[PDB]
Design an enzyme around this catalytic site. Structure first.
Site, PDB file in Angstrom:
ATOM      1  N   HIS A 105      48.950  42.725  45.582  1.00 45.72           N
ATOM      2  CA  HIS A 105      49.051  41.304  45.859  1.00 45.72           C
ATOM      3  C   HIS A 105      50.388  40.913  46.475  1.00 45.72           C
ATOM      4  O   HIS A 105      50.487  39.836  47.069  1.00 45.72           O
ATOM      5  CB  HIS A 105      48.818  40.543  44.560  1.00 45.72           C
ATOM      6  CG  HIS A 105      48.482  39.101  44.748  1.00 45.72           C
ATOM      7  ND1 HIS A 105      49.301  38.087  44.302  1.00 45.72           N
ATOM      8  CD2 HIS A 105      47.411  38.499  45.312  1.00 45.72           C
ATOM      9  CE1 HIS A 105      48.753  36.925  44.594  1.00 45.72           C
ATOM     10  NE2 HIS A 105      47.605  37.146  45.206  1.00 45.72           N
ATOM     11  N   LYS A 151      30.459  40.015  52.851  1.00 45.48           N
ATOM     12  CA  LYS A 151      30.519  41.365  53.397  1.00 45.48           C
ATOM     13  C   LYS A 151      30.568  42.422  52.299  1.00 45.48           C
ATOM     14  O   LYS A 151      30.094  43.542  52.506  1.00 45.48           O
ATOM     15  CB  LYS A 151      31.729  41.495  54.320  1.00 45.48           C
ATOM     16  CG  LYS A 151      31.695  42.702  55.223  1.00 45.48           C
ATOM     17  CD  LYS A 151      32.898  42.767  56.121  1.00 45.48           C
ATOM     18  CE  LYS A 151      33.089  44.139  56.686  1.00 45.48           C
ATOM     19  NZ  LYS A 151      33.601  44.193  58.049  1.00 45.48           N
ATOM     20  N   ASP A 152      31.146  42.094  51.142  1.00 41.37           N
ATOM     21  CA  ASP A 152      31.068  42.968  49.981  1.00 41.37           C
ATOM     22  C   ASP A 152      29.666  43.024  49.393  1.00 41.37           C
ATOM     23  O   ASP A 152      29.290  44.040  48.803  1.00 41.37           O
ATOM     24  CB  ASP A 152      32.052  42.505  48.903  1.00 41.37           C
ATOM     25  CG  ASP A 152      33.499  42.835  49.232  1.00 41.37           C
ATOM     26  OD1 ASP A 152      33.753  43.833  49.936  1.00 41.37           O
ATOM     27  OD2 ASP A 152      34.396  42.101  48.764  1.00 41.37           O
ATOM     28  N   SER A 198      46.847  44.032  52.000  1.00 48.11           N
ATOM     29  CA  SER A 198      46.171  45.172  52.581  1.00 48.11           C
ATOM     30  C   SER A 198      46.657  45.434  54.002  1.00 48.11           C
ATOM     31  O   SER A 198      47.244  44.577  54.663  1.00 48.11           O
ATOM     32  CB  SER A 198      44.662  44.938  52.572  1.00 48.11           C
ATOM     33  OG  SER A 198      44.160  44.824  51.259  1.00 48.11           O
ATOM     34  N   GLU A 228      30.367  70.522  36.400  1.00 47.79           N
ATOM     35  CA  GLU A 228      29.696  69.606  37.302  1.00 47.79           C
ATOM     36  C   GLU A 228      30.240  69.760  38.719  1.00 47.79           C
ATOM     37  O   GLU A 228      31.288  70.364  38.950  1.00 47.79           O
ATOM     38  CB  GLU A 228      29.870  68.167  36.822  1.00 47.79           C
ATOM     39  CG  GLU A 228      28.947  67.761  35.685  1.00 47.79           C
ATOM     40  CD  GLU A 228      27.486  67.695  36.096  1.00 47.79           C
ATOM     41  OE1 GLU A 228      27.169  66.977  37.064  1.00 47.79           O
ATOM     42  OE2 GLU A 228      26.654  68.365  35.455  1.00 47.79           O
TER      43      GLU A 228
HETATM   44  C1  HEM Z   1      38.911  52.690  39.311  1.00 47.52           C
HETATM   45  C2  HEM Z   1      39.521  53.106  40.416  1.00 47.52           C
HETATM   46  C3  HEM Z   1      40.040  52.166  41.528  1.00 47.52           C
HETATM   47  C4  HEM Z   1      39.798  50.868  41.749  1.00 47.52           C
HETATM   48  C5  HEM Z   1      38.901  49.908  40.954  1.00 47.52           C
HETATM   49  C6  HEM Z   1      40.536  50.473  42.923  1.00 47.52           C
HETATM   50  C7  HEM Z   1      40.553  49.223  43.484  1.00 47.52           C
HETATM   51  C8  HEM Z   1      41.106  48.899  44.694  1.00 47.52           C
HETATM   52  C9  HEM Z   1      40.890  47.690  45.448  1.00 47.52           C
HETATM   53  C10 HEM Z   1      39.994  46.504  45.046  1.00 47.52           C
HETATM   54  C11 HEM Z   1      41.605  47.777  46.563  1.00 47.52           C
HETATM   55  C12 HEM Z   1      41.673  46.703  47.655  1.00 47.52           C
HETATM   56  C13 HEM Z   1      40.495  46.809  48.618  1.00 47.52           C
HETATM   57  C14 HEM Z   1      40.444  48.125  49.335  1.00 47.52           C
HETATM   58  O1  HEM Z   1      41.486  48.553  49.887  1.00 47.52           O
HETATM   59  O2  HEM Z   1      39.350  48.735  49.377  1.00 47.52           O
HETATM   60  C15 HEM Z   1      42.309  49.034  46.558  1.00 47.52           C
HETATM   61  C16 HEM Z   1      43.159  49.496  47.529  1.00 47.52           C
HETATM   62  C17 HEM Z   1      43.862  50.668  47.506  1.00 47.52           C
HETATM   63  N1  HEM Z   1      43.690  51.682  46.594  1.00 47.52           N
HETATM   64 FE1  HEM Z   1      42.426  51.629  44.977  1.00 47.52          FE
HETATM   65  N2  HEM Z   1      41.229  51.566  43.389  1.00 47.52           N
HETATM   66  C18 HEM Z   1      40.948  52.618  42.555  1.00 47.52           C
HETATM   67  C19 HEM Z   1      41.445  53.887  42.683  1.00 47.52           C
HETATM   68  C20 HEM Z   1      42.369  54.304  43.601  1.00 47.52           C
HETATM   69  C21 HEM Z   1      42.817  55.659  43.791  1.00 47.52           C
HETATM   70  C22 HEM Z   1      42.275  56.838  42.960  1.00 47.52           C
HETATM   71  C23 HEM Z   1      43.712  55.662  44.787  1.00 47.52           C
HETATM   72  C24 HEM Z   1      44.523  56.824  45.397  1.00 47.52           C
HETATM   73  C25 HEM Z   1      44.772  57.970  44.776  1.00 47.52           C
HETATM   74  C26 HEM Z   1      43.868  54.300  45.233  1.00 47.52           C
HETATM   75  C27 HEM Z   1      44.703  53.869  46.235  1.00 47.52           C
HETATM   76  C28 HEM Z   1      44.573  52.684  46.915  1.00 47.52           C
HETATM   77  C29 HEM Z   1      45.326  52.264  48.073  1.00 47.52           C
HETATM   78  C30 HEM Z   1      46.426  53.099  48.756  1.00 47.52           C
HETATM   79  C31 HEM Z   1      44.897  51.051  48.436  1.00 47.52           C
HETATM   80  C32 HEM Z   1      45.399  50.180  49.614  1.00 47.52           C
HETATM   81  C33 HEM Z   1      44.653  50.492  50.907  1.00 47.52           C
HETATM   82  C34 HEM Z   1      45.010  49.554  52.023  1.00 47.52           C
HETATM   83  O3  HEM Z   1      45.401  48.393  51.759  1.00 47.52           O
HETATM   84  O4  HEM Z   1      44.899  49.983  53.194  1.00 47.52           O
HETATM   85  N3  HEM Z   1      43.028  53.498  44.496  1.00 47.52           N
HETATM   86  N4  HEM Z   1      41.975  49.699  45.401  1.00 47.52           N
HETATM   87  C1  UQ6 Z   2      41.645  42.950  48.141  1.00 44.26           C
HETATM   88  O1  UQ6 Z   2      40.926  41.860  47.650  1.00 44.26           O
HETATM   89  C2  UQ6 Z   2      40.414  42.003  46.334  1.00 44.26           C
HETATM   90  C3  UQ6 Z   2      39.066  42.281  46.141  1.00 44.26           C
HETATM   91  O2  UQ6 Z   2      38.232  42.445  47.248  1.00 44.26           O
HETATM   92  C4  UQ6 Z   2      38.542  42.408  44.867  1.00 44.26           C
HETATM   93  C5  UQ6 Z   2      37.041  42.729  44.774  1.00 44.26           C
HETATM   94  C6  UQ6 Z   2      39.368  42.247  43.758  1.00 44.26           C
HETATM   95  C7  UQ6 Z   2      38.827  42.389  42.296  1.00 44.26           C
HETATM   96  C8  UQ6 Z   2      38.498  43.887  42.079  1.00 44.26           C
HETATM   97  C9  UQ6 Z   2      38.046  44.426  40.934  1.00 44.26           C
HETATM   98  C10 UQ6 Z   2      37.801  45.942  40.995  1.00 44.26           C
HETATM   99  C11 UQ6 Z   2      37.760  43.624  39.618  1.00 44.26           C
HETATM  100  C12 UQ6 Z   2      38.407  44.280  38.369  1.00 44.26           C
HETATM  101  C13 UQ6 Z   2      37.323  44.911  37.400  1.00 44.26           C
HETATM  102  C14 UQ6 Z   2      37.679  45.426  36.196  1.00 44.26           C
HETATM  103  C15 UQ6 Z   2      39.143  45.408  35.754  1.00 44.26           C
HETATM  104  C16 UQ6 Z   2      36.573  46.046  35.247  1.00 44.26           C
HETATM  105  C17 UQ6 Z   2      36.796  45.630  33.769  1.00 44.26           C
HETATM  106  C18 UQ6 Z   2      35.497  45.883  32.939  1.00 44.26           C
HETATM  107  C19 UQ6 Z   2      35.481  45.706  31.607  1.00 44.26           C
HETATM  108  C20 UQ6 Z   2      36.739  45.263  30.868  1.00 44.26           C
HETATM  109  C21 UQ6 Z   2      34.168  45.975  30.828  1.00 44.26           C
HETATM  110  C22 UQ6 Z   2      33.726  44.729  30.012  1.00 44.26           C
HETATM  111  C23 UQ6 Z   2      32.364  45.078  29.329  1.00 44.26           C
HETATM  112  C24 UQ6 Z   2      31.994  44.680  28.095  1.00 44.26           C
HETATM  113  C25 UQ6 Z   2      32.920  43.838  27.213  1.00 44.26           C
HETATM  114  C26 UQ6 Z   2      30.596  45.133  27.563  1.00 44.26           C
HETATM  115  C27 UQ6 Z   2      29.775  44.045  26.835  1.00 44.26           C
HETATM  116  C28 UQ6 Z   2      28.770  44.764  25.907  1.00 44.26           C
HETATM  117  C29 UQ6 Z   2      28.059  44.115  24.979  1.00 44.26           C
HETATM  118  C30 UQ6 Z   2      28.206  42.600  24.811  1.00 44.26           C
HETATM  119  C31 UQ6 Z   2      27.072  44.930  24.098  1.00 44.26           C
HETATM  120  C32 UQ6 Z   2      27.074  44.483  22.634  1.00 44.26           C
HETATM  121  C33 UQ6 Z   2      26.861  45.735  21.739  1.00 44.26           C
HETATM  122  C34 UQ6 Z   2      27.857  46.506  21.300  1.00 44.26           C
HETATM  123  C35 UQ6 Z   2      27.550  47.715  20.420  1.00 44.26           C
HETATM  124  C36 UQ6 Z   2      29.323  46.228  21.613  1.00 44.26           C
HETATM  125  C37 UQ6 Z   2      40.715  41.966  43.962  1.00 44.26           C
HETATM  126  O3  UQ6 Z   2      41.572  41.800  42.871  1.00 44.26           O
HETATM  127  C38 UQ6 Z   2      41.238  41.831  45.242  1.00 44.26           C
HETATM  128  O4  UQ6 Z   2      42.621  41.559  45.404  1.00 44.26           O
HETATM  129  C39 UQ6 Z   2      43.012  40.321  45.934  1.00 44.26           C
END
Ligand code: HEM
Ligand code: UQ6
Ligand code: CN3
Ligand code: 8PE
Ligand code: HEM
Ligand code: HEM
Ligand code: 9PE
Ligand code: 9PE
EC number: 7.1.1.8
Lengths: 93, 54, 75, 99, 385, 50
Positions: free
Chosen positions: E202, E228-229, E206, E272
């Site tokens: 932030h 688009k997402d 990007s 795996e």
């Molecule tokens: C649970 C795993 C991850 C989540 C949820 C996540 C999420 C995100 C999101 C939402 C963005 C912004 C949108 C995008 O660039 O597609 C981003 C960008 C980025 N992520 Fe991840 N990410 C994850 C894992 C990783 C890993 C494993 C790496 C590298 C080892 C990584 C490196 C980067 C980088 C470098 C960017 C910036 C790219 C750019 O702005 O050109 N992220 N990530």
């Molecule tokens: C670049 O532009 C972007 C952008 O495009 C996006 C998408 C995001 C947002 C991206 C994300 C990946 C969102 C973040 C998502 C997470 C951190 C995932 C977190 C998930 C959890 C904490 C899981 C929560 C689940 C539960 C609590 C389960 C509920 C279960 C129940 C109620 C069952 C009941 C029974 C039992 C036995 C518990 C940005 O922040 C962003 O930056 C400006």
């Protein structure tokens, strides 16, 4: 809280680029345009230009690594046959 | 012309039509898939076998 | 009255042009193994020849010809 | 398990509730195993005492012997109970036990 | 001002997913990070609903997963969506990371964002390993045997950390009960690394496929990149549904439907499909201690990449030689997976020793040498002397 | 390894439950339980089926 370290990006009104002077932009509403006239003459004529520009940087590496995989298989096929029992005995020890 | 001021304009029109129209979609959609699936595999099912050895 | 269906096809395709050749290559080779350990040096030799590969070559071909046809004959 | 091996010359017969999913080949392997015993092994292979040749088994020597011969059951509906027919049914019944 | 900008809690949502400024030229490769957030939500939800029926005791574990498949209503949907969901989670992450290698997203000022990502990748390999052992099949028992015995080669503390992981003298009931309890935990540590990951994005935003500044042309997130997402979300669910409902056991091993038996060993013990490239780097070194160091070094060598790129241009868009060698590295990573699923046999031993040299040579010898060549090639093609 | 140590490749027969829109043939399941009770069950268990 207090301000943090300054960055290379701001927000709407102050984004941190250079000052602009002499550029004009025009646009039209989507409601006033004909529906999606951009799918065809784009999936054949443009998609072929994009393919021809970049396919050589992928398929020469792929050809190298796939040829190396088949020559390794066929040689392993041969060592464990009846005809390749004498060569298997040497290259082990 | 009037196909927006009553059908689309509001969105208490259109949350209600969407949520209400989602229920009658399920019951009608399920009956149609279940009838096509059982007719495509007629003769293999248990009710057809049970009806051949009474 | 009804004999098993798979032997009727296995026997029919052993008369195939491809099936006539793969039989004799297994036989001529069975006659070679009759002697090679019948000679002295029974169980002390390093290795000895089987005919598993010639049997697999016949079996593999015989299975690619009978597989897509059999289940139309069974109930 | 002690009594199971005592009646099969040391080999243990497995449970069959998941044998279709726990083997590479699925229904095609169970069927070919049962209809794949030749009446004499190929020339050269020396079987240990108490084992039989089946080329679909890895190694070529399996502790099970052939158990399917023609007309050993009589079906209620009157289908001819040949060797290939009985095999097609157990492999269809056993896949239902897995799935 | 608007309520979404003045409220303490909605201000964060507005600043991140509504009014966030984005470059106009980003393509569909920038959509993989939103999918990885959906993958984590799928896994945490399905796993919690299965945990209500699971038993972690070593005599009850295998039969409890079959109780989920036969007796629980909609239980086969929960499991297969969970087992195939993890394979889809790892495939989207390899594409996310390879994107950053191509467009230069690791370079300054985004070095800290790249380093928190490497930590997420380590915690996700750990999570997937611990859960595959909770099944206690035949691959589940012998995979934990050969991996936990690698820490026996550490000098002077090796034989004491293995008996401490196992809780005894072998993979046994203390082992399976503690692997399940750690397995629920670590997904919540990943969720906190993701929050720290977004915070580092932030402050600079990007990048874009051209590799130049984006502050001259920005559009907001709502209704351009929200919709688009949405295109790639429904393609993800469609391809996942095709695997859960029509081919639910194609990305697994049959031997894991046999219960674990420590007296009988399998003929081939493999992980795996997504740990096979790293399993082949381990077998390439003929010494036990050096193979464990090299396996872990293959993940931490990503951290030296901000320092060995010697280019004044960001990304590979306008680079001829760096394009060719990016795809050499991709197909070398696929051959390492194939080698890891083969037998220890000629010529699959030499093939895996050459291909593991090309993995370490890309980061350390190839990038700094051709990046220096491309700088000088741009200079002499324009400057007249 | 050698082909004898891996085993022969099982061919591909045309099962009537292969395909994305096909069910089991339920007259073969009934017919198949009769073959289990009279041949297999002497030396094989089915402990996970109620
Ligand atoms: C649970 C795993 C991850 C989540 C949820 C996540 C999420 C995100 C999101 C939402 C963005 C912004 C949108 C995008 O660039 O597609 C981003 C960008 C980025 N992520 Fe991840 N990410 C994850 C894992 C990783 C890993 C494993 C790496 C590298 C080892 C990584 C490196 C980067 C980088 C470098 C960017 C910036 C790219 C750019 O702005 O050109 N992220 N990530
Ligand atoms: C670049 O532009 C972007 C952008 O495009 C996006 C998408 C995001 C947002 C991206 C994300 C990946 C969102 C973040 C998502 C997470 C951190 C995932 C977190 C998930 C959890 C904490 C899981 C929560 C689940 C539960 C609590 C389960 C509920 C279960 C129940 C109620 C069952 C009941 C029974 C039992 C036995 C518990 C940005 O922040 C962003 O930056 C400006
Ligand atoms: C297994 C689990 C996977 C599940 C998730 C699937 C998502 C994978 C997406 C991978 C990816 O990001 O590749 C993006 C790349 C497109 O790059 P681009 O932005 O320049 O094209 C914009 C387009 O021209 C405008 O397309 P438009 O915006 O008009 O419509 C998009 C629509 C397709 O529309 C059409 O009818 C054909 C034009 O839907 C999609 O395209 C969905 C996105 C795939 O795709 C390409 O077409 C070329 C690259 C091929 C990638 C293959 C290698 C990956 C294995
Ligand atoms: C830890 C190590 C992780 C490494 C993981 C490696 C495996 C990941 C598999 C995905 C690799 C590809 C992702 C990276 C590519 C992102 C950039 C990209 O789009 O590729 C460049 C190329 C052309 O893109 P442009 O140059 O035109 O950019 C401007 C676009 N407006 O766009 C293309 O033409 C894309 C063509 C991709 C073809 C190669 C497919 C690779 C998959 C092989 C699978 C083999 C069987 C398993
Ligand atoms: C239609 C009848 C039967 C079927 C379909 C059947 C099925 C099977 C299957 C699938 C295997 C495992 C093969 C493998 O793992 O590759 C097996 C093993 C075995 N079966 Fe049967 N079985 C039948 C009847 C019998 C009978 C009547 C006996 C009587 C002794 C028997 C004894 C064994 C033994 C000893 C093994 C172990 C094989 C070994 O370890 O080498 N089976 N059976
Ligand atoms: C990042 C998130 C997660 C990943 C990558 C993951 C991965 C896995 C994998 C690969 C398996 C083995 C699949 C199989 O072959 O059966 C598994 C099993 C299991 N996982 Fe998860 N898991 C995650 C989250 C969770 C959570 C939060 C729980 C909560 C209890 C959970 C519960 C289980 C259970 C009970 C099993 C055993 C049942 C089964 O085999 O499906 N998982 N996990
Ligand atoms: C890292 C952890 C995540 C941290 C939060 C970030 C994610 C945001 C959470 C989701 C946003 C939803 C927040 C609700 C927006 C309305 C809040 C509000 O009206 O503020 C309050 C009332 O809220 C409440 O009663 C308690 C909020 C319950 C929270 C539900 C979990 C109104 O207060 P107001 O700003 O108008 O000024 C005082 C005027 N009497
Ligand atoms: C107990 C459960 C854990 C949940 C809380 C998560 C805290 C884990 C800390 C993870 C450290 C991440 C480092 C990766 C980035 C390294 C590159 C870099 O220069 O960034 C580091 C980021 O370091 C930190 O994140 C630690 C701050 C505490 C966080 C409190 C919210 C630069 O900042 P820092 O000064 O802290 O590190 C150098 C120390 N002189």
């Amino acid at each position: 809280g207090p301000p943090s370290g300054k960055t290379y990006m701001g927000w709407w009104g102050h984004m941190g680029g250079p000052k602009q002077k002499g550029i004009t932009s025009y646009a039209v509403s989507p409601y006033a345009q004909k529906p999606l006239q951009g799918i065809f003459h784009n999936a054949v004529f443009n998609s072929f230009r994009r393919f021809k520009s970049q396919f050589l940087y992928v398929l020469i590496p792929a050809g190298i690594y796939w040829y190396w995989w088949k020559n390794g298989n066929e040689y392993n096929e041969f060592l464990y046959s009846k005809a390749g029992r004498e060569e298997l005995e040497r290259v082990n020890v | 012309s009037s196909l927006y001021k009553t059908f689309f304009k509001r969105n208490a029109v259109f949350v209600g039509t969407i949520f209400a129209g989602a229920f009658v979609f399920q019951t009608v959609f399920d009956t149609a898939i279940t009838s096509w699936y059982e007719n495509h595999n007629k003769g293999k099912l248990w009710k057809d076998v049970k009806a051949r050895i009474a | 009255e009804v004999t098993d269906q798979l032997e009727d096809l296995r026997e029919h395709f052993k008369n195939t042009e491809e099936g006539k050749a793969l039989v004799h290559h297994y036989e001529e080779c069975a006659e070679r193994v009759k002697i090679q350990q019948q000679q002295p040096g029974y169980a002390d030799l390093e290795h000895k020849e089987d005919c598993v590969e010639e049997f697999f070559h016949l079996q593999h071909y015989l299975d690619t010809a009978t597989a897509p046809r059999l289940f139309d004959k069974l109930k | 398990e002690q009594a199971a091996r005592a009646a099969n010359q040391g080999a243990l017969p497995p449970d069959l509730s998941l044998i279709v999913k726990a083997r590479h080949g699925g229904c095609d392997y169970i069927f070919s195993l049962l209809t794949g015993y030749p009446d004499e092994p190929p020339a050269g292979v020396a079987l240990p005492p108490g084992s039989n040749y089946n080329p679909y088994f890895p190694g070529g020597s399996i502790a099970m012997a052939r158990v399917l011969f023609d007309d050993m059951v009589e079906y209620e509906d009157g289908t001819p109970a040949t060797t290939s027919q009985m095999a097609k049914d157990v492999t269809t019944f056993l896949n239902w036990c897995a799935e | 001002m608007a309520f979404r900008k003045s409220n303490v809690y909605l201000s964060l949502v507005n600043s991140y997913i509504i009014d966030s400024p984005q470059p106009s030229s980003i393509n569909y490769w920038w959509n993989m990070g939103s999918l990885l957030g959906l993958c984590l939500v799928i896994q945490i939800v399905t796993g919690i609903f299965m945990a209500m029926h699971y038993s972690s005791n070593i005599e009850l574990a295998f039969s409890s997963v079959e109780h989920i498949m036969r007796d629980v209503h909609n239980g086969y949907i929960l499991r297969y969506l969970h087992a195939n969901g993890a394979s889809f989670f790892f495939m989207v992450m390899f594409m996310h990371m390879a994107k950053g290698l191509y467009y230069g997203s690791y370079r300054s000022p985004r070095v800290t964002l790249w380093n928190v990502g490497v930590i997420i990748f380590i915690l996700t390999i750990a999570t997937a390993f611990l859960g595959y052992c909770c099944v206690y099949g035949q691959m589940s028992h012998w995979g934990a045997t050969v991996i936990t015995n690698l820490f026996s080669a550490i000098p002077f503390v090796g034989n004491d950390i293995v008996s401490w992981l196992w809780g005894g003298f072998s993979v046994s009931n203390p082992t399976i009960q503690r692997f399940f309890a750690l397995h629920y935990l670590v997904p919540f540590i990943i969720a906190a690394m993701v929050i720290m990951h977004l915070m580092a994005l932030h402050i600079h935003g990007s990048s874009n496929p051209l590799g130049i500044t984006g502050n001259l042309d920005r559009i907001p997130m709502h209704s351009y990149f929200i919709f688009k997402d949405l295109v790639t979300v429904f393609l993800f669910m469609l391809i996942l549904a095709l695997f859960v409902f029509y081919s639910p056991n194609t990305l697994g091993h049959p031997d894991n439907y046999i219960p674990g038996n420590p007296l009988v060993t399998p003929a081939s013990i493999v992980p795996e499909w997504y740990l096979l490239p790293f399993y082949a780097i381990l077998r390439s070194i003929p010494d036990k201690l050096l193979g464990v160091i090299t396996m872990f070094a293959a993940i931490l060598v990503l951290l030296v990449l901000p320092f060995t790129d010697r280019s004044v241009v960001r990304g590979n868009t306008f680079k001829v030689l760096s394009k060719f060698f990016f795809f050499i590295f991709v197909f070398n990573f696929v051959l390492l997976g194939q080698i890891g699923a083969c037998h220890v046999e000629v010529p699959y031993v030499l093939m895996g020793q050459i291909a593991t040299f090309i993995y370490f040579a890309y980061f350390l010898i190839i990038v700094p040498v051709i990046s220096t060549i491309e700088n000088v090639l741009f200079y002499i093609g324009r400057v007249n002397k | 390894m050698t082909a004898a140590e891996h085993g022969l490749h099982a061919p591909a027969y045309a099962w009537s439950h292969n395909g994305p829109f096909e069910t089991f043939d339920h007259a073969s399941i009934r017919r198949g339980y009769q073959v289990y009770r009279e041949v297999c069950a002497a030396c094989h268990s089915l402990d996970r089926v109620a």
